[PDB]
């Protein structure tokens, strides 16, 4: 019933706040900071590990401010939080790749408007 491509979600992920893999990243090492210190605490689960490594492997922005800026930039334009996160996580190159990856951007914007959007992403994309 739930369909990302058709932009369908169950009611719980309507007021949900999305993230970018780099947001999740920085928060997960934040929690590593909490865990490594504060002894007499349970070690983080292998699930926590798998997600940590993954988001680390694909966090396209390695600076907090840059992530914030990315976000903010995606906010000011009418976009769904879902597409917000998919664009920022996937970092597509050309407008047509975006459509292939995020069909829910079908007809929403113009390919050129979108293109300079993507370009704005990429230009904020931090070196690492």
């Amino acid at each position: 019933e739930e369909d990302a491509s058709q932009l369908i979600f169950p009611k719980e992920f309507e007021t949900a706040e999305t993230l970018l893999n780099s947001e999740v990243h920085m928060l997960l090492e934040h929690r590593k900071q909490q865990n490594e210190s504060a002894e007499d605490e349970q070690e983080l689960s292998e699930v926590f590990m798998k997600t940590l490594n993954y988001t680390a492997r694909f966090s396209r922005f390695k600076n907090r401010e840059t992530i914030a800026s990315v976000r903010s930039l995606l906010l000011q334009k009418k976009l769904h939080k879902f597409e917000l996160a998919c664009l920022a996580n996937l970092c597509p190159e050309t407008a047509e790749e975006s459509k292939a990856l995020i069909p829910s951007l079908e007809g929403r914007f113009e390919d050129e408007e979108l293109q300079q959007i993507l370009d704005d992403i990429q230009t904020k994309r931090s070196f690492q």
């Binding site: 719980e12 349970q42 997600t51 988001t55 996937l90």
Partner: protein, 171 residues
């Protein structure tokens, strides 16, 4: 996808924890209970960020325990059908490619791998390749893939992938 959502829980507090430092105990029990688990309604529960409200703790008549209802926020990772995410192959079989989209495990049946690719077990690292090897997926490679189907198993989500359409696969 990763999200940040608000949730519900009631903890029973044994009377040994009445005393100073008892709300901490309500915390620490929320931590030790909710985190690390996976539920199909919400998907992988990565961690709990910030609680909101500790309710009024009702002594249960007889039996001692106090029941505190709690409000809290947590990170969750919930795939959805028709989504495209990056994934890392961990191992390659003639059936398909086992990948993981983070904590979740995903699989791409041979049929879902395009037709050009063939599976080559004979390779020094086993891999799926084209005859000319212009594109080669093997261990540790990152790929994009459409989550075409997901399934619940023991509160554990695993996805079903596809590399059909344009701009998927080997990154």
């Amino acid at each position: 996808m990763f999200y940040h959502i608000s949730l519900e829980h009631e903890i029973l507090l044994h009377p040994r924890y009445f005393g100073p430092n008892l709300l901490n105990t309500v915390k620490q029990k929320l931590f030790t209970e909710v985190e690390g688990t996976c539920t199909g309604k919400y998907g992988f529960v990565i961690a709990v960020t910030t609680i909101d409200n500790i309710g009024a703790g009702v002594i249960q008549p007889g039996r001692g325990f106090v029941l505190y209802p709690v409000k809290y926020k947590a990170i969750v990772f919930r795939p959805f059908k028709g989504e495209v995410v990056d994934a890392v192959v961990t191992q390659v079989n003639k059936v398909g490619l086992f990948t993981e989209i983070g904590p979740m495990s995903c699989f791409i049946s041979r049929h879902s791998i395009p037709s050009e690719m063939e599976f080559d077990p004979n390779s020094n690292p086993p891999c799926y390749k084209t005859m000319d090897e212009d594109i080669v997926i093997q261990q540790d490679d990152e790929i994009r893939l459409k989550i075409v189907g997901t399934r619940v198993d023991k509160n554990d989500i695993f996805a079903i992938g596809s590399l059909m359409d344009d701009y998927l696969g080997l990154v």
